[PDB]
């Protein structure tokens, strides 16, 4: 029997989902590209990049700042160029992000009012920016990555531009706060350049202002799909600028719209928590150009801020998110009839809490604030507030617990903790080397020495810099398209032996004293967890497909891995949530503990096992003795306090009312 | 008290017919009744036996002056209702009906009874007033 | 009413008619009696639930601005 400390005094709240954007244009005929990714905008300024392959695994996270958010997300995918992401922060600035480092590559002032909407054209060489002053700004991006130039200003008008959509590279369609849709001409070499050809007014609420929240263009039949505050969806003929059909469908605001590749299905969502399906599959409907409201579905407990769609030969995804802070995935073709998945609110790919076996200290760092609890029944011994706007990326605590290191992309700071009067006295140790150092990852060799991996992936040792040589990685087309895959994702230091894993599956053993790098493994799948066991002299690596690999540290693979990698229990294979944390068992070194967002597992590595829909089919390549329990969930963090003590840390808004009839 | 509780526990395990004698013992007090039910009645089998014994006795003589046999059933029902209805024995249901019927009369009897208490409290005071 | 009938019970017996002159008393009383059967049922269920449940940072605060100032 083995002690569990089930703790919920640690609270983390994800920021509300604000924007969603897929990296590639849907092509049903072609297979899913290896580089397909989904970007998620958060109300706390964090941008989350996820991979639809191997169920859904989060490749990289861009960290936000205080009083920051993402109101619009936009991708640019030019053939032969690195994938580019652009975001709007609710101000007069357009930010292009360095995906390699996760830092702002370029900040561009629109020279206009507060930005409300962002959109990119078909040729992917221009951006349209909707401003609070009613001005639409056209920005050229074809120059290169990090290159942003003012192209042209469409006519200033007095209504806020809430949304923007394009028609090829010729026209800009914008929904305005005066309940009025505006069409501007973007055709160069045309006397009507930037001219407002047609302007449509929606039905207006009698006792309230009317806002056109979302507008989408439909190439196949050449109409505009618009959703306003009144809950009505209107379909408009572009060439004549006339209303074709109206559907008073939603009882509340329609905030977002999306359509399928073939423009046969138009999907709407908003405050009423429902997703409405509009259909024109039937041939007579296509001949008559008449849409039909097939169905609706209630899947969210709160507002649906963002909706996005993707299709391919092996992918058919409808992804939704909003105030509920969780992702809901559905099949576009089978929205009414298909199954759905509700993603966990928190999936701890990056560990935001740590537990110190010595002193029994639990440390959590949220929003530049670090809280320390002691367990004997729990007391918050210390809480620390940091000045810098940038959020804390990582925190590392020494084995003794006296020295706490707080790492941010901007700076790294070290604070010594002294126990006085059942409370910890905090003193900031001054180290110029660390202060001007970016800290992507930071681990302790011992009470004094530390290994730090910079945002540029420069590994060095600081005694409280002894740089460590790293093997060069061959460039690949996928690496060119997605830069961060070649970057260091998991670093681990264990008894002077350091292991680094990249998103491309390259695993290397690093000897910290020798400061030399030796290759270990080259896996075909993204690595989600890494662990070093000194007793068995092996390193445990977990891929995105939840396969467990044990490599001898110099057979390349241990005999257990050779026998058990494909022979894992049904529970491990059936999991749709990937493993994110591994920790050893003090009582028995061979036993290892593995836990995910909603599950915990223990495997004995001295015993061989008995031989006996909503994700990409994965036809294409990714690039170019046993205990299992799900009773505890959702899991922030799991680890040992002592040989028989387990720490489990778990998570403990008004919404549109939709009554449930009961009889 | 402890001895009788152990004796009752042993009789429950042994299927002894002296369960009724143990239950009617005068050493029992209300807090002990709660304590025994909560801590010693952990098996559905024991719970059914105690209910069956109590129900049969009360059904036979619902007008017994001994408040103890009713005293047991009160908290046995109050504290173990969720477990009692979980019992699927057909005989247990039949005894409940028999007990339900045996009790059922009394409630019809009481409204007539109270008025006739009134006639007596009435007749006294005149007799006392006439005496005075 | 009880004392009125108790003391003058003998007088009331020697009255030609009682029901007609005391019709309101019987009707008024009869309504109250009908409450007793049901009302007992409520006390039982009310007693059932009654018995059931009846037996059943600033000090540690550290801030960097405040330390930096003094």
């Amino acid at each position: 029997r083995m002690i569990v400390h089930r703790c919920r005094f640690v609270d983390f709240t994800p920021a509300t989902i604000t924007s969603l954007a897929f990296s590639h244009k849907s092509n049903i005929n072609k297979l899913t590209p290896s580089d397909l990714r989904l970007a998620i905008g958060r109300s706390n300024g964090n941008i989350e990049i996820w991979n639809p392959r191997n169920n859904w695994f989060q490749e990289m996270v861009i960290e936000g700042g205080k009083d920051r958010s993402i109101e619009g997300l936009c991708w640019s995918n030019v053939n032969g160029e690195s994938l580019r992401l652009f975001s709007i922060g609710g101000s007069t600035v357009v930010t292009e992000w360095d995906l390699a480092t996760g830092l702002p590559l370029r900040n561009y002032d629109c020279n206009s009012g507060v930005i409300w909407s962002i959109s990119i054209n078909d040729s992917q060489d221009k951006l349209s920016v909707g401003c609070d002053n009613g001005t639409v700004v056209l920005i050229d991006i074809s120059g290169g990555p990090g290159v942003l130039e003012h192209d042209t200003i469409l006519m200033r008008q007095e209504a806020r531009v809430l949304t923007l959509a394009w028609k090829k590279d010729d026209f800009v369609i914008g929904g305005c706060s005066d309940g009025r849709i505006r069409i501007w001409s973007a055709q160069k070499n045309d006397e009507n350049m930037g001219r407002l050809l047609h302007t449509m007014k929606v039905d207006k609420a009698k006792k309230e202002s009317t806002l056109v929240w979302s507008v989408i263009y439909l190439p196949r039949t050449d109409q505009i799909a618009s959703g306003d505050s009144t809950g009505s969806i209107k379909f408009w003929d572009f060439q004549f600028a006339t209303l074709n059909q109206s559907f008073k469908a939603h009882d509340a605001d329609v905030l977002c719209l999306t359509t399928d590749t073939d423009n046969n299905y138009v999907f709407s969502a908003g405050v009423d928590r429902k997703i409405f399906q509009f259909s024109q599959n039937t041939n007579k409907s296509q001949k008559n150009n008449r849409w039909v409201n097939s169905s609706n579905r209630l899947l969210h407990g709160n507002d649906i801020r963002a909706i996005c769609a993707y299709q391919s030969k092996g992918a058919d995804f409808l992804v939704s998110g909003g105030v509920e802070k969780t992702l809901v995935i559905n099949s576009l073709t089978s929205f009414s009839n298909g199954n759905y998945r509700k993603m966990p609110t928190v999936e701890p790919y990056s560990k935001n809490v740590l537990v110190n076996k010595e002193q029994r200290l639990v440390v959590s760092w949220s929003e530049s604030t670090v809280k320390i609890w002691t367990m004997g029944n729990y007391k918050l011994v210390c809480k620390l507030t940091l000045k810098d706007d940038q959020n804390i990326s990582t925190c590392s605590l020494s084995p003794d617990g006296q020295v706490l290191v707080v790492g941010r992309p901007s700076t790294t700071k070290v604070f010594h903790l002294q126990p006085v009067g059942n409370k910890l006295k905090v003193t900031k140790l001054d180290n110029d080397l660390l202060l001007r150092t970016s800290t992507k990852l930071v681990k302790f060799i011992d009470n004094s020495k530390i290994v730090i991996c910079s945002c540029e992936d420069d590994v060095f040792i600081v005694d409280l810099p002894q740089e460590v040589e790293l093997l060069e990685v061959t460039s690949t087309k996928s690496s060119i398209k997605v830069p961060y895959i070649n970057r260091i994702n998991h670093l681990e230091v264990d008894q002077n032996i350091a292991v680094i894993s990249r998103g491309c599956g390259v695993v290397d053993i690093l000897d910290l004293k020798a400061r030399i790098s030796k290759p270990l493994a080259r896996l075909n799948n993204f690595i989600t967890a890494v662990h070093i066991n000194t007793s068995r002299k092996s390193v445990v690596v977990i891929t995105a497909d939840n396969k467990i690999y044990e490599f001898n540290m110099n057979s390349v693979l241990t005999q257990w891995s050779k026998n058990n990698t494909d022979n894992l229990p049904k529970e491990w294979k059936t999991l749709k949530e990937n493993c994110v944390g591994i920790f050893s068992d003090i009582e028995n070194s061979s036993r290892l503990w593995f836990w995910g967002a909603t599950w915990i597992s223990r495997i004995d590595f001295d015993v061989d096992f008995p031989i006996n829909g909503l994700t990409i089919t994965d036809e294409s390549n990714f690039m170019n003795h046993f205990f299992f329990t799900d009773k505890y969930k959702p899991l922030l963090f799991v680890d040992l306090i002592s040989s028989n003590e387990l720490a489990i840390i778990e998570r403990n808004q008004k919404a549109f009312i939709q009554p449930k009839l009961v009889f | 008290q402890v001895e009788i509780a152990n004796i009752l526990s042993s009789h429950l395990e042994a299927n002894s017919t002296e369960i009724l004698d143990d239950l009617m013992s005068g050493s029992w007090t209300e807090p002990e009744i709660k304590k025994f039910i909560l801590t010693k009645i952990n098996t559905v089998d024991h719970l059914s036996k105690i209910f069956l014994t109590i129900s049969k006795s009360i059904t036979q003589n619902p007008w017994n002056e001994e408040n103890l046999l009713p005293l047991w059933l009160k908290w046995l029902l109050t504290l173990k209702s969720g477990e009692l209805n979980s019992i699927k024995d057909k005989h247990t249901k039949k005894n409940c009906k028999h007990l339900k019927s045996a009790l059922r009369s009394s409630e019809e009897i009481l409204p007539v009874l109270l008025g006739i208490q009134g006639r007596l409290e009435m007749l006294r005071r005149q007799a006392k007033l006439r005496e005075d | 009413v009880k004392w009125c009938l108790i003391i003058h019970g003998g007088y009331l017996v020697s009255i030609p008619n009682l029901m007609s002159t005391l019709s309101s008393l019987h009707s008024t009383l009869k309504r109250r009696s009908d409450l007793l059967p049901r009302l007992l049922a409520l006390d039982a269920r009310l007693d059932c639930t009654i018995n059931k449940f009846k037996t059943l940072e600033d000090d540690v605060e550290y801030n960097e601005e405040l330390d930096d100032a003094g």
């Binding site: 089930r6 919920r8 | 009360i58 009713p70 339900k100 009481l110 | 007992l40 007693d47």
Partner: peptide, 29 residues
């Protein structure tokens, strides 16, 4: 005595008719 018994039997008839933030446990493996 009958009144007491009848009210009692009435009560018996009517009877017949009718997460923590932190938890501490010790689990088997």
């Amino acid at each position: 005595k009958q009144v007491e018994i009848a009210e009692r039997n009435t009560e018996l008839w009517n009877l017949i008719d009718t997460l923590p933030t932190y938890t501490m446990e010790y689990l088997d493996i």
